[PDB]
Design a protein around this ligand. Sequence first.
Ligand SMILES: [Zn+2]
Ligand SMILES: [Zn+2]
Ligand SMILES: [Zn+2]
Lengths: 249, 182, 431, 381
Amino acid sequence: TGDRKGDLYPSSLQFYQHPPTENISLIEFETFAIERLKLLKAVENLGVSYVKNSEEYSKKLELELRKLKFPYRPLHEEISDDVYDLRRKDHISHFILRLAYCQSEDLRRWFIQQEMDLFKFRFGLLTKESVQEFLKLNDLQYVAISEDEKNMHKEDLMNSSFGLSLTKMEDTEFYKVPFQAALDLVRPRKVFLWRGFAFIPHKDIVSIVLNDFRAKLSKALALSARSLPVVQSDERLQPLLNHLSHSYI
Amino acid sequence: RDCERFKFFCPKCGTENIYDNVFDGSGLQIEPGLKRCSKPECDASPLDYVIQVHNKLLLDIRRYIKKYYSGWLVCEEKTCQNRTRRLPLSFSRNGPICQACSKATLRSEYPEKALYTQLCFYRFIFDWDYALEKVVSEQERGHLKKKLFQESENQYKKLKSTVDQVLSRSGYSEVNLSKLFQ
Amino acid sequence: QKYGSRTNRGEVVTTYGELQGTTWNGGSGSNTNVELFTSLDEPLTKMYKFMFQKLMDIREVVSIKIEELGASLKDHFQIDEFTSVSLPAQETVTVLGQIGCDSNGKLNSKSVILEGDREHSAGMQVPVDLSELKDYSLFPGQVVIMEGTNSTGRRFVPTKLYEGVPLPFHQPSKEFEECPQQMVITACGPFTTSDTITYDALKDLIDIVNRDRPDICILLGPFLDAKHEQIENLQLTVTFEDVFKRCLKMIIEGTRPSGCHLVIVPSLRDVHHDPVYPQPPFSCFEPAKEDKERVHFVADPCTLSVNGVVIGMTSTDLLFHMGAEEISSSDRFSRILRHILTQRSYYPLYPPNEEINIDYEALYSYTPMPVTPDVFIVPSELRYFIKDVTGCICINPGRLTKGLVGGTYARFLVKSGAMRSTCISAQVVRV
Amino acid sequence: YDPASLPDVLPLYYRRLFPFYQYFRWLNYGGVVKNYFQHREFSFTLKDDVYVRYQSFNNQSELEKEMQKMCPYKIDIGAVYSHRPSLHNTVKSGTFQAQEKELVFDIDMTDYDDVRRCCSSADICPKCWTLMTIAVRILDRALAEDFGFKHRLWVYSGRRGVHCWVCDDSARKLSQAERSAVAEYLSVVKGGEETIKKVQLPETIHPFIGKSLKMVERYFEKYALVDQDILENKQCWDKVIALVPEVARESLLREFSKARSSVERWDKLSSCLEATRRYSNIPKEIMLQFCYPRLDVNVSKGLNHLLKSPFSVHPKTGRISVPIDCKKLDQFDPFSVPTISLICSELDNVRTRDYKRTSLAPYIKVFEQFLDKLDQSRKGE
Ligand SMILES: [Zn+2]
Ligand SMILES: [Zn+2]
Ligand SMILES: [Zn+2]
């Protein structure tokens, strides 16, 4: 927090809910737009080439994020100025690309897909503590079963979660979710269902988070497409936004 | 491609130097344009007279701004080509209606995009970092990314600061994100 | 050489008002209150983004100018209805519009066209025939109301040209009733001789300021002229900003003994400043802590309040610009000054002269004259003068330097509520 | 039963036996949601296999009328749409959407053909019906314990199997994806006729699979070892041998040459597998492959699926699609189910109580109890 910083960027991951309000330069605008376009194209290429759970995918995506200087890893130090800068980048670039990727349904779908992929990766890199922090800052309020109920269903929980040891299981706390949100977990039978609720440990959760994210993002893109006439009049940003999808990187 | 290039007359020999890129030459013979005069017999380095280069840059920027604000309009009809400074209040859906023929639109002789591109070009011909990344090759980049050019780099940064300052005051160097995202 | 050996130093070349002694003395800005005239519209005090004008915006600004002035004049004259300029009129009709030239040259009596506003005429033009008008004075961009007939539907024939209506003067508050008379020394650039960059005339003027201790010193640009022979041919060994900074330091530091409020007005000929009109104030110089309250970097044009006295000032050569285009049936400068006052704008000429860059949104926002000023400083390449136009004292102090020879400045005394004689005395004096 | 006699009996039944009052109570769901019954899709199959859909009705009177008028051979219930199906032509394209429907399962004996020996195709017998008896318990328990669905109506399909209607308000608002998830969660026996090993359990037995195996075990000895005799001769036990690793197959064959009873052969197989540990679940995989229900995910996935209405008449057997009481499941007999001919003989042998004089009464009673439970849930909530 050097000169003009604040608590505007608490966590690395964000749902991109609040538009930026700053006054940036045209050079900064262009640099951020192109950089995030490179990041999203890299995400798409790696998704096509590799399996998203593969270690090659993770290594290459980390390399790209480091090369373009985007937030991808947490830091249990504090909000360092450099970190703040990176987060600001991410936040502005995203919305710029929204302006670029809301004109046509095709484009919209593409954008959504890439964004979801990136978000998933970043979630996959979050430590449990950080994960909870995130789940709190956005009022997702995911916790929580009692200890007594846990002992009540101890054996069921043990046989539900893959690769969970007795003592290690005793060291873990689950959450109760309606089964309509754990579709991806229930469908392959990797989480216990009791009386319409799934008991999810502290792998499937990302799915629910992503669902929420996707909903929000789709809505946002619709609104952006509804607010397009105000931007077309700005010649400075027309060559970029109207043709970003066809920009050599 | 339609922008005027930077013309600077050497104080010593008086020969015109046309600048259209940060760097001139190929391979290890590549050096910043303002390092040596275009006349082989002339040993004067324009980088020595950087105050004069700054003054000429400001004068050129003033010239282009004056050209833009002159507000010259030409009829788009080939058979009319009426040239006027006066903008009439009578407009069609496409713009001002030419008062000579009453059937064609008046177009700006020097539109805002022209001035913006001219200022961007003047920034381009002084963008050391951009030239190194995009324009310059690999071996040339290596030869230019050493010492013996740091002073030239600093002077080029100072000269680019002028065009950046001018562009910051153009509505066609600041983007108000509040107006975009609401 | 020629300037330094001049023999007419201190000669009073023009005088007006109450006779004063051979020596003028001021209060050193002791009981002086200088501010920008507090009107409804906010003043231009900072840079505005420019170089981006949409033709639609220019159309709207010009149209609303015509509409607003016509509305005020219609209320004043009790005119019933305005008629579209373009439509034919067999009987006499009243039409509101703005004057213009049918070609790119200079206006003449046979090349006058009237362009109506969007509200009453859809922006249509009509040629004007001035054969039936006995007396007239027209310049391009002049908003006029005329009674006339258009029998052929192709040529408007005015029969009456309504006179202009100047804004009312300012009614000063009693807060400054007990303040003494204030002395103002006004000078306009160029400040250096054509063949020098040493600012000798400026040094002489600063000596005069310290000698007479005026209450306000109004310095109008250019301070680093773009047309200076040294500037154009690139013979300067230092940057433009450095020369301007040196000049401003000279002015501010040299006036420390006088304690005089300095009002600096930029000029379109300032090679170091943004070339756009209305010109924002200078912002490249930070006065020391001991001169912050004395220096006022104002915009071109400026309406200043000095103990209740409203002074209008512009660096632009309005008289030269409009004299080249004004056509009259039969004092020319008085006519042009009255035109400026009645149009209620510091630059009513449209299209402008070739030497001024006009941003029309800023022109709309910052060129309306709030009231009719008590004093109107209008430096010009034309001859110096002190005229009384409709109760406003219009002062042209000339330029401090006229080529190789020294020029002139002006000194006047202003007191709110005097006698309407807000200008006690005024004099154009030689440097 | 004479199917040429079907066109003679159908009207009388639809006039004096079909329980319209309770039917409307069901599909109207206590009137809570407006247009709920009015937006329900029906489909009719008339004589000479003439199919009509997008049938909707204003209330019970209109339904009784148009049904008694058409005398359909088949009645299928479909989704509740955004508008009335009758006016689907009037609804702007894309604005006609199926919004709610019961969650339904169809279990059909024909899907068990590769694993039953007593009958084939559409033939059923008392020796194979126990499979249905298992399914209803295995599935319904899950639906009552894992998912918490509280209002579940099991109905005989008339010939080859059983349907289940899960009618909880939550179950009626489930999207297509949620339905597919529910179906896949309940589904274990995966594969077609080209696959031999259709169950491959992991090392960890998911609690649901443990409880399904527990339910299976209670019946397995009677169904598979006594009745089906899945180890009667070589032609059959060769299959079960084909379902286990080759390593012990030879060891088993000699043993199966010295066994006189299939119960003995099962004991021997269990002992041999236990002696041989990652294969400790192989007997469970065999039991599941012979006992676990098979579910057509296409039946339950789609919202727009038209399923046989309760109290329909089977075009071939003539039996009435009667509800099955869960408690008395072990006593259910698909061969004693009233046929339309029997209930018309009963009707012509003696207004709102005529059905109480036929053998149809206890099944309408079970349906009335189920509807009473639904009403209690609608009120209490
Ligand atoms: Zn040279
Ligand atoms: Zn034309
Ligand atoms: Zn059988």
